[PDB]
Amino acid sequence: LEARLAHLGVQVKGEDEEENNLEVRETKIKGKSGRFFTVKLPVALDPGAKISVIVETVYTHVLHPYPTQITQSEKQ
Amino acid sequence: VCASGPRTLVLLDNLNVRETHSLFFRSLKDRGFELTFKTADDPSLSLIKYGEFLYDNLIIFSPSVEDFGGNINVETISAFIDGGGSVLVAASSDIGDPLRELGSECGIEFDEEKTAVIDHHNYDISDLGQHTLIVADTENLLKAPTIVGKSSLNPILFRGVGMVADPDNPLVLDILTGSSTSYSFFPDKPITQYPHAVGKNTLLIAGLQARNNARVIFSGSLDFFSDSFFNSAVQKAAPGSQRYSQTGNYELAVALSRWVFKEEGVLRVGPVSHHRVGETAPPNAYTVTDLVEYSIVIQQLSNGKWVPFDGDDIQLEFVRIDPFVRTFLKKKGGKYSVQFKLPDVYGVFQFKVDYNRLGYTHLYSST
Amino acid sequence: WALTPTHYLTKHDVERLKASLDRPFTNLESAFYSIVGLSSLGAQVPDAKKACTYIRSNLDPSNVDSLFYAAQASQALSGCEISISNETKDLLLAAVSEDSSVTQIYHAVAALSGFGLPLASQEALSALTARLSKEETVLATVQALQTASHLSQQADLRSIVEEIEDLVARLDELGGVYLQFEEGLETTALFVAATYKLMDHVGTEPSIKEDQVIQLMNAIFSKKNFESLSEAFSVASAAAVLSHNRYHVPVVVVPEGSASDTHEQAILRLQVTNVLSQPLTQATVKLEHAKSVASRATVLQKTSFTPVGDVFELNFMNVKFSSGYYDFLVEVEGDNRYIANTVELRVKISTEVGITNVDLSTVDKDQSIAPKTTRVTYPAKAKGTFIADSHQNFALFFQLVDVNTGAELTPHQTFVRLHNQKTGQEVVFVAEPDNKNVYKFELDTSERKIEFDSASGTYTLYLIIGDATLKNPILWNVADVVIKFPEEEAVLSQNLFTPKQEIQHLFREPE
Ligand SMILES: *[C@@H]1O[C@H](CO)[C@@H](O[C@@H]2O[C@H](CO)[C@@H](O[C@@H]3O[C@H](CO[C@H]4O[C@H](CO[C@H]5O[C@H](CO)[C@@H](O)[C@H](O)[C@@H]5O)[C@@H](O)[C@H](O)[C@@H]4O)[C@@H](O)[C@H](O[C@H]4O[C@H](CO)[C@@H](O)[C@H](O)[C@@H]4O[C@H]4O[C@H](CO)[C@@H](O)[C@H](O)[C@@H]4O[C@H]4O[C@H](CO)[C@@H](O)[C@H](O)[C@@H]4O)[C@@H]3O)[C@H](O)[C@H]2NC(C)=O)[C@H](O)[C@H]1NC(C)=O
């Protein structure tokens, strides 16, 4: 699905959605295939802490008609 | 690479047919076909799922079945042939209506039920005394090496219902005709009316080459493929007839099966190049009386590997409404090419190649 | 009509079955199947002394399966005594218990009978019935029947016998010709052997109907290939019991040789044999009646056949059969054990046809000139050319009669074929008799244009006469006729695969 990824957005789970959007940069991690993204947290996460984040992705062309051909009456 | 995939569906009126015809199925399986055996009446039978074909080849060894199970129907089989699938049909005196209807769509006319081919002069000595088991001479066999095999064949035994090819349909192939004395009629009932098939008009085996190149073979006799005929010796009842150790049924059956399943005679057309002489690219428009070079490449499928075609009779045409120029294409450098001067009349001309030969796939190219 | 046996062991089949039994031994079970199966057919082992030693070496006293196979195989072998320990006797008796399968009871009881060890037959039956109540499968039931055949008559075998009616109902029928269980050929052959063997020992006739037994044997013999030793042994036992038993003997009746062309000899010979192809020499045969297919009236009745060697022959020189098909009803009499004793066979009488007084003539279509007729007779071909054209028509007249009797004949096939010598085309016409039974054919060029496609030329003329009953079909070149149709006032499709004519372009000349 990496080729078909139209957009990626990350925001922290909080009331301040407008300000909770996180900066994301495309990154390549050595030795591992596939696209990766580096997300900068608003505050550093110290040992033993947790945070909740929401990741949204949109893919294009991932739905393929089957059967390929239909008549006027036939459904999709 | 086989033009038709190995997936084959076999329809049997009775399961016992597989045992009786073990030799034919084993020879087919040895060639890498993936056979699946289902009863012809079985409800689960289906050919098309979601617009795709479940099977590439269909063999209907179900002469007596009145109706097909599940969704299989004469319309469905017709669509399947249009898709390019190869179909084999075997008939008998018990022929049900669907088989006759299928022949009607293909232009091969089966005779009425209970009729049989009667030959009083060439019937085998082993016949029950009804003169319906006829020893078919190899002379009637069609003169097509690709379809029937180059090798010579011994006399073949046929017992079944005669069929007549429709004159109107050009594509019909008279693979095996009956003897001059043979005719199709009800044996018990006297011949008041004119026979449905008389003399050499009667057809025992016929083939069809569709415009899409689908191939279907109709056999009058299911028993012809039976193991019993394959091993049985043949001697004509009439006096002075030699006795042959083995029949030619097995060898002929193998050759026909190869032809139906696109194992022989398959041809493909590759890139065609035209340009002005001395030029490497085609001009947008040519001038009057200019000299141009035309090149095309054709291939043949041998043993599943494409190779340069050896055909020497290929003819090129330059046409506007009627053919202004026609000439043979020379075989040079693995390609067929010719150089000629354009006519003095301007217009929207088309280059045409129409190499259609008996038993081979029909090739048409237009630029 | 009673059902005739459709499958049986022919003389070739019985020998092939013996070969299938006569295979090298690989295990005690193999020895039991081969040796016992041959014994049932009456065949012997060439190396019987070696076979007994082989059983002795492989016999394990602590294994029930070995004991059963060794005991039966040794019993089949002559004088094949094998040492048995007391511990073996305890093992066989212990095997017969409520906590062991019916199959186990069968092996233990059979082993005891073969060795001759004493057994408590009543106790063995009590264990067998108790296990059989849970083990209601067909295979368990058949083994129980065999166990009863080994148990003493004092035991209450009636309970075991009652299963036989249940099994017969449980049989699956293919419709009027075959009866077999779902388990296949092996179960049917064993069941027939068990039913006959148990019933013979008990002294009561099998309850199975004679027609049902005929169907059951047909299923057993439907397939003539026995791949495994077990299949051969079971079938051999079934054939042996059927061949000779106290109640039912299947009577196979078939005509020897082809009766289609019987007119040459006018002798009918019928083979009468059992399922093993052994002729029933003690039987007597008679032709109950003979009927004509055409009218259904009897022509002969109550004429007895004579035993001539193996076959039964009936002479009918006195009666001059007319051309046609006749059906003979024959009955086998004598031993009461015979089943399916009545068989119906169809014989055909042939004759030869003579064509005489054929006159080939040409007539002026307007009738101004009297018809010109040239007399011809088969096979002498007509001399000279006959013209059929816009002015003169052509006609054929011939009479068909039986050579032997001179009666009028109407052959099923009577066609006139005109073959174009140059093209090779053939045109076939059907000739029909008139009221007087003289065939008349007329050729009119103007009307017949559609049939010939108005294709003029010389055509060889042939007479085709044939019928199923006719000994001598005739294809005669009667004459040569030239047909000239009216000249046409004014085809390339057939050249589907040919080079087309070369076409060139004529460039305009320079000024
Ligand atoms: C406006 O639009 C109109 C609509 O199209 C245009 O009208 C068209 O004009 C073209 C050009 O003239 C016509 O084609 C020509 O027609 C000629 C007359 O037709 C004869 O053909 C009949 C054939 O009958 C059957 O033939 C076969 C049988 O199997 C079958 O396939 C076919 O379908 C048909 O049923 C024949 O019986 C009658 O005689 C007819 O009169 C016809 O002769 C021309 O054929 C020529 O040319 C064509 C190429 O165009 C070749 O394919 C032919 O083989 C043949 O070629 C020979 O003649 C040429 C000149 O005629 C030469 O250049 C060739 O080299 C070659 O030479 C040989 O023959 C010469 C004599 O013919 C000899 O001198 C030589 O020595 C050689 O032997 C051609 O078909 C269309 O018919 C016509 N269509 C209509 C609907 O009317 C009109 O032009 C437009 N107007 C303007 C101003 O633009």
Side-chain angles (χ1 to χ4, degrees):
Chain A
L1 294 178
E2 70 185 356
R4 303 261 49 97
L5 176 67
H7 173 78
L8 181 145
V10 186
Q11 53 169 2
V12 173
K13 177 193 192 156
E15 181 53 67
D16 298 355
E17 287 203 304
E18 66 280 8
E19 293 164 48
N20 284 343
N21 287 296
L22 299 188
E23 197 279 344
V24 304
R25 291 197 309 289
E26 176 56 23
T27 301
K28 160 55 62 190
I29 177 61
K30 303 295 291 166
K32 287 185 290 179
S33 72
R35 293 167 68 191
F36 290 71
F37 296 85
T38 284
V39 185
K40 195 75 179 197
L41 293 179
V43 173
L45 185 76
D46 66 351
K50 59 183 73 72
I51 55 173
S52 51
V53 301
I54 308 188
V55 175
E56 302 196 18
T57 67
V58 176
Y59 302 99
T60 54
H61 315 88
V62 303
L63 308 181
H64 297 285
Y66 185 60
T68 66
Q69 281 200 3
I70 57 171
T71 64
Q72 267 189 292
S73 65
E74 280 179 302
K75 308 197 166 287
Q76 186 169 245
Chain B
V1 59
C2 296
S4 277
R7 299 178 299 171
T8 300
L9 168 61
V10 176
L11 296 182
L12 304 181
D13 54 356
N14 193 0
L15 271 296
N16 199 40
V17 172
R18 178 160 56 170
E19 299 299 346
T20 55
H21 293 55
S22 295
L23 280 175
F24 177 70
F25 292 122
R26 168 150 57 258
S27 195
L28 187 63
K29 189 264 181 197
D30 290 5
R31 269 178 288 148
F33 286 95
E34 300 172 1
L35 298 167
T36 192
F37 296 89
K38 292 189 172 175
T39 293
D41 168 48
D42 193 303
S44 72
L45 282 169
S46 55
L47 285 179
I48 283 167
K49 196 86 201 84
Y50 297 134
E52 55 164 302
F53 287 101
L54 301 178
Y55 305 100
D56 298 323
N57 319 292
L58 175 67
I59 298 169
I60 315 181
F61 275 15
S62 163
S64 66
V65 173
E66 295 86 355
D67 57 330
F68 299 113
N71 298 311
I72 298 192
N73 188 3
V74 174
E75 56 87 3
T76 311
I77 298 168
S78 296
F80 179 89
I81 307 154
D82 291 349
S86 293
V87 177
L88 197 152
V89 178
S92 67
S93 294
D94 310 342
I95 175 158
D97 42 351
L99 290 177
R100 302 193 58 210
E101 293 176 51
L102 182 63
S104 176
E105 302 319 317
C106 287
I108 300 176
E109 310 179 13
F110 289 94
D111 208 352
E112 294 300 321
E113 181 160 3
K114 183 58 170 66
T115 64
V117 176
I118 307 192
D119 186 350
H120 298 115
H121 302 81
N122 305 267
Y123 66 94
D124 190 306
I125 186 169
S126 313
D127 177 89
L128 274 292
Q130 190 54 78
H131 302 168
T132 55
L133 168 62
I134 71 190
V135 179
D137 292 331
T138 187
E139 294 153 54
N140 308 295
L141 185 61
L142 177 63
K143 186 62 63 202
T146 293
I147 317 175
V148 309
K150 58 205 64 74
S151 69
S152 66
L153 297 169
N154 302 354
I156 62 188
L157 284 177
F158 172 91
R159 183 177 194 151
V161 161
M163 40 198 182
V164 174
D166 183 352
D168 80 350
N169 186 342
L171 315 188
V172 183
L173 313 171
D174 299 328
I175 300 167
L176 184 69
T177 74
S179 60
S180 56
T181 63
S182 65
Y183 64 98
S184 66
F185 207 78
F186 293 93
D188 54 9
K189 202 271 185 170
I191 185 156
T192 59
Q193 294 89 9
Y194 193 73
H196 176 62
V198 54
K200 288 192 195 168
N201 298 352
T202 310
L203 301 185
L204 316 183
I205 317 170
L208 179 77
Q209 173 79 17
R211 299 196 189 287
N212 79 98
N213 304 316
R215 289 173 181 172
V216 186
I217 291 285
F218 288 84
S219 168
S221 177
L222 172 60
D223 302 328
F224 168 90
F225 302 112
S226 75
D227 295 7
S228 171
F229 290 7
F230 280 18
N231 300 303
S232 182
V234 60
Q235 171 174 36
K236 301 199 178 164
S241 311
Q242 298 209 318
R243 169 155 180 109
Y244 292 89
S245 308
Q246 63 163 346
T247 47
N249 296 311
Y250 181 41
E251 297 101 304
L252 182 56
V254 169
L256 289 170
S257 175
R258 293 273 294 290
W259 185 85
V260 174
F261 298 147
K262 304 294 191 73
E263 301 289 324
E264 279 177 292
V266 188
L267 300 177
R268 172 168 69 184
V269 171
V272 54
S273 294
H274 51 58
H275 47 252
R276 288 170 155 173
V277 70
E279 288 193 42
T280 187
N284 177 64
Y286 296 90
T287 60
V288 162
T289 198
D290 197 357
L291 197 154
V292 303
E293 173 169 55
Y294 180 96
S295 300
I296 189 164
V297 63
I298 292 167
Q299 285 178 309
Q300 169 173 12
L301 184 74
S302 183
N303 302 338
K305 56 159 174 76
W306 295 103
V307 293
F309 185 44
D310 193 10
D312 188 17
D313 193 11
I314 303 175
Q315 285 184 334
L316 173 75
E317 290 171 303
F318 199 63
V319 182
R320 191 179 64 170
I321 296 166
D322 41 4
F324 279 61
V325 179
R326 182 186 300 128
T327 185
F328 293 95
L329 282 181
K330 308 307 298 154
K331 174 67 169 224
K332 170 191 56 63
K335 283 191 139 45
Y336 294 95
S337 65
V338 66
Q339 293 187 356
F340 74 104
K341 191 186 296 288
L342 298 190
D344 55 4
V345 175
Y346 55 81
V348 190
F349 292 87
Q350 285 183 352
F351 284 104
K352 286 202 174 193
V353 171
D354 192 8
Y355 186 70
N356 178 16
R357 295 297 173 256
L358 177 60
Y360 289 101
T361 309
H362 175 199
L363 305 182
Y364 176 84
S365 182
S366 173
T367 63
Chain C
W1 296 102
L3 170 62
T4 299
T6 55
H7 300 271
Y8 67 98
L9 303 181
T10 74
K11 276 301 208 312
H12 172 66
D13 203 355
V14 172
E15 297 298 317
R16 187 181 178 285
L17 182 63
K18 287 163 60 179
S20 308
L21 294 164
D22 190 15
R23 298 203 219 172
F25 306 144
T26 60
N27 193 293
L28 276 181
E29 67 252 15
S30 78
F32 158 79
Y33 295 143
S34 286
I35 301 164
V36 178
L38 290 176
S39 181
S40 296
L41 297 181
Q44 307 202 302
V45 172
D47 313 299
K49 277 47 168 197
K50 183 261 184 206
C52 186
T53 61
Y54 174 88
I55 297 158
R56 284 171 177 156
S57 307
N58 287 273
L59 166 56
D60 172 12
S62 77
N63 172 243
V64 176
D65 294 331
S66 164
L67 287 162
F68 160 60
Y69 297 137
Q72 292 298 313
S74 62
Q75 170 154 307
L77 293 181
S78 56
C80 180
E81 275 63 65
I82 307 181
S83 315
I84 290 292
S85 81
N86 303 308
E87 171 274 311
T88 293
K89 180 187 182 174
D90 170 44
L91 167 62
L92 294 176
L93 293 180
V96 179
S97 294
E98 287 181 63
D99 319 304
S100 301
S101 62
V102 167
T103 311
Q104 174 49 264
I105 296 167
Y106 164 49
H107 287 173
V109 166
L112 293 158
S113 86
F115 298 131
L117 292 166
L119 165 65
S121 296
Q122 177 62 8
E123 192 272 327
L125 174 66
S126 78
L128 178 73
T129 299
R131 203 71 179 132
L132 187 64
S133 78
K134 274 154 148 193
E135 273 194 12
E136 196 264 328
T137 68
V138 178
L139 178 66
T141 303
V142 166
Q143 288 167 352
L145 295 169
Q146 297 182 10
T147 300
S149 85
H150 291 290
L151 292 185
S152 174
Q153 299 184 350
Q154 301 147 13
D156 185 10
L157 299 183
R158 304 174 307 168
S159 66
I160 306 300
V161 165
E162 279 181 50
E163 275 85 5
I164 299 175
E165 292 88 37
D166 294 328
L167 285 192
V168 163
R170 289 163 72 181
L171 285 165
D172 293 316
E173 63 189 14
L174 316 187
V177 184
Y178 312 95
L179 290 173
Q180 69 268 20
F181 298 103
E182 191 64 66
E183 289 95 321
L185 162 72
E186 295 96 304
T187 177
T188 42
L190 293 171
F191 172 60
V192 164
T195 294
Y196 274 102
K197 185 175 174 181
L198 170 62
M199 280 303 197
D200 292 328
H201 189 76
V202 172
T204 63
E205 181 167 351
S207 60
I208 313 188
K209 291 184 216 159
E210 301 184 348
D211 189 285
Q212 292 180 345
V213 173
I214 293 284
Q215 290 173 347
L216 274 157
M217 61 180 284
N218 291 337
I220 291 161
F221 304 127
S222 294
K223 185 170 279 299
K224 298 182 144 199
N225 195 339
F226 311 127
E227 298 296 66
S228 70
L229 284 72
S230 199
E231 286 156 77
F233 151 82
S234 56
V235 167
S237 75
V241 296
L242 291 172
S243 173
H244 174 80
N245 65 71
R246 298 156 169 104
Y247 314 112
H248 309 119
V249 169
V251 175
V252 164
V253 182
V254 300
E256 178 178 4
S258 186
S260 172
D261 210 357
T262 194
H263 193 208
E264 295 169 1
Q265 308 165 355
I267 300 294
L268 175 61
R269 292 176 297 122
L270 298 180
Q271 293 282 24
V272 177
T273 81
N274 61 10
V275 304
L276 279 188
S277 299
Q278 158 61 48
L280 299 174
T281 65
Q282 298 293 325
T284 284
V285 179
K286 56 171 55 167
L287 167 61
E288 174 45 37
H289 65 70
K291 276 186 166 196
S292 174
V293 75
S295 68
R296 310 305 304 122
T298 57
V299 169
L300 185 53
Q301 290 189 184
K302 302 148 184 182
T303 306
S304 302
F305 262 85
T306 49
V308 286
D310 49 359
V311 308
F312 277 94
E313 175 173 292
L314 173 76
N315 186 4
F316 51 85
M317 285 312 107
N318 50 16
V319 290
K320 303 288 97 200
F321 286 90
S322 50
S323 312
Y325 293 62
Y326 298 81
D327 53 312
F328 280 23
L329 173 59
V330 289
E331 180 159 313
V332 180
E333 304 198 307
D335 180 8
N336 287 316
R337 290 182 298 172
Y338 293 160
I339 70 178
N341 67 299
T342 313
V343 168
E344 178 80 31
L345 67 94
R346 176 70 68 76
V347 58
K348 184 189 69 172
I349 304 303
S350 49
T351 193
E352 62 201 69
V353 54
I355 170 165
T356 66
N357 291 308
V358 52
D359 300 292
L360 183 154
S361 61
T362 46
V363 183
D364 181 354
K365 71 200 296 172
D366 67 2
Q367 203 72 324
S368 64
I369 306 173
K372 179 217 150 187
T373 76
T374 287
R375 177 65 175 284
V376 190
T377 284
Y378 165 87
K381 181 190 184 190
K383 60 158 290 279
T385 288
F386 283 81
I387 176 61
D389 65 355
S390 64
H391 304 281
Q392 291 209 317
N393 290 340
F394 165 78
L396 288 174
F397 287 77
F398 55 92
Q399 307 178 354
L400 304 183
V401 289
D402 175 28
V403 179
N404 300 333
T405 67
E408 296 296 318
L409 279 180
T410 61
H412 190 285
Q413 173 179 31
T414 299
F415 300 156
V416 174
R417 178 184 62 155
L418 302 95
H419 176 120
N420 187 296
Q421 193 56 82
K422 300 165 293 294
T423 74
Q425 189 53 232
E426 314 184 316
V427 172
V428 192
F429 292 118
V430 185
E432 286 180 60
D434 70 344
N435 52 309
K436 299 191 312 291
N437 302 289
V438 63
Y439 282 78
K440 64 172 292 279
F441 164 83
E442 292 176 69
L443 175 62
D444 44 349
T445 71
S446 316
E447 178 44 36
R448 288 296 185 267
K449 62 197 165 287
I450 193 170
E451 297 302 334
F452 291 85
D453 297 3
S454 74
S456 305
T458 59
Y459 287 77
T460 310
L461 187 63
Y462 289 87
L463 289 192
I464 320 181
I465 301 165
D467 202 323
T469 190
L470 287 174
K471 294 182 64 61
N472 178 17
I474 285 168
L475 168 59
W476 177 32
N477 177 358
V478 64
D480 290 326
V481 61
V482 55
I483 308 163
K484 299 180 197 182
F485 292 94
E487 293 295 327
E488 278 63 15
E489 292 282 52
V491 184
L492 179 52
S493 61
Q494 318 177 70
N495 285 301
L496 175 63
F497 68 106
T498 56
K500 299 194 166 204
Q501 181 203 358
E502 182 74 11
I503 307 175
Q504 304 291 15
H505 185 76
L506 186 64
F507 286 77
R508 52 218 174 186
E509 296 204 339
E511 296 87 355

